[model samples]
Target: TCGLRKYKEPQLHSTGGLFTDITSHPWQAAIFAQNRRSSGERFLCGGILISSCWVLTAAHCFQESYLPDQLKVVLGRTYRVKPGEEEQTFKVKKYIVHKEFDDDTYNNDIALLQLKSDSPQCAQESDSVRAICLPEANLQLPDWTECELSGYGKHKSSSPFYSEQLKEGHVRLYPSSRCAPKFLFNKTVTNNMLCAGDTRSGEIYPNVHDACQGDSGGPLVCMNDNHMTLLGIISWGVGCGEKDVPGVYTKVTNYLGWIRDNMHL
Candidate 1:
């Protein structure tokens, strides 16, 4: 349930990086923390579908102390609030947040989610649903490499509503020299963290394509040797769409072994 198609040609638009097509991001997964009394779903964060039953996300996403039963994962949906016929939802059987996760600095922001299922077939392969490949050991991409980040976050930083449709944004990786504490107001910028900034940002419109509040735990994917590869996990940022500010993500390459050891089914 992995290989899905990308846009025939780059479809850049005004929303996010560009308003992507329905099946454009098949590896995207929406993580929701449920409320029992109200019988509703709360869009907590975004995740990358790494396998049929395993999802990759940020550790800080569970800061509210959500239980396994209260968390659910939805896949194959383009619209933020709407469910497609090809969509599939799964409850969390278990989750493993990095033991050394630091919420204060968000140093180790990686986490894994296992889908609840009796059989190994928790997810089936489909055109609209699939998983993204994890980067290999010691894999390195050059600085300023263009990457794609997709989410359904608000159009504006302070907006109250999440985007109605899935959207994408283009960003460039920042070299370690610039991705440092000084650049981010003395914030802890660990080696396990990677920085990416919106290349389209400007002073006139400030319609910079960057991730927002609801976009945490999402994938920061890049093309590696003609293949779409997962590079980072959306973690945090100072403010959305601000000039010279970049979104910080948990470097996916640092957690490959942790993921392999934790994956079930």
Candidate 2:
């Protein structure tokens, strides 16, 4: 009752410009999904609490849109917290995916999940759990920006509480000319893709607060008043913690229209 067939895996990006084929990490990772279990236990993803009930994440985080019953959001919690530790868990209500998301190149990899309950306590306790501000203008955007990228992604292996708390990577601005090729996005690598990272060597640790599979809709923050402004959405990457390759994010400024139009509630 089976057919004979063989399928090969697609080739990954190389490491000359050193685009690591493996996904390294993300900035605003979250579990803004619909599920029954406590997904807050894992910090391998990120999201932005735009509304009291809405979370923006990558479409790949919910390819099948299946984990709703097992979904939960932990805003203040960064890394994987043990059951013994106290963590705020929110219920996922629904998710809105981009109309033109492509899995081949990972373009339009943005998604928004709404929460059943808004945990204001987490946002109050930790600045990590806060609404992301929108962008103003391209020319007004900072050239050398310092972003406090927080995620529960892979640590430096020397992380004290590897499974204890969420880790943050302070990343800088990386020009589009440099971050483009490493991104490995073929058709989707347009001017709409805003890039940023260390201008020098060894400034940030490897895989610094970058986007991984689970960290799709998190934020790439820029300082705007005294709070972190939502610059970009953590989309996808070739590999994690490579030398030259910086993470590529979905420019929030470009999709402002789609975001507002896609708003259901």
Top lDDT prediction, candidate number: 1
Q: Please, what is the whole-model Cα lDDT of each candidate in the order they appear?
A: 0.82, 0.54
What are the per-residue Cα lDDT tens digits for candidate 1 across 1-265?
Answer: 2444656444565543467754777888888987677777888888888888888888988868888999989898888889877998999999999999998999889899999888887866677777888889778899999998988777778889987778788889988898888988788899889999886655465667788888888888898877788999989887787777788889998888888887742
- For model 2, the superposed segments whose C-alpha errors exceed 4 Å read 1-29, 32-44, 83-86, 118-128, 137-140, 156-164, 182-188, 202-214
TM-scores, all candidates, are 0.92, 0.70
Worst 10 residues of 2 by lDDT: 15-24
Which runs of model 1 end up more than 4 angstroms from their true locations? 1-4, 8-17
For model 2, residues 1-265, the per-residue Cα lDDT tens digits are: 0111121222222211112111112123347343444444433356766654566776666654565556677654434444213334676666677878777766777777766744433233232334555666553465667764545444333344322334444566676666665355443475556665544456433344344444456667666666457777777666655555677777777776777777663
Displacement of residue 116 (Cα, Å) in model 2 is 1.5
Task: Report clashes for each candidate as comma-separated counts.
Answer: 2, 34
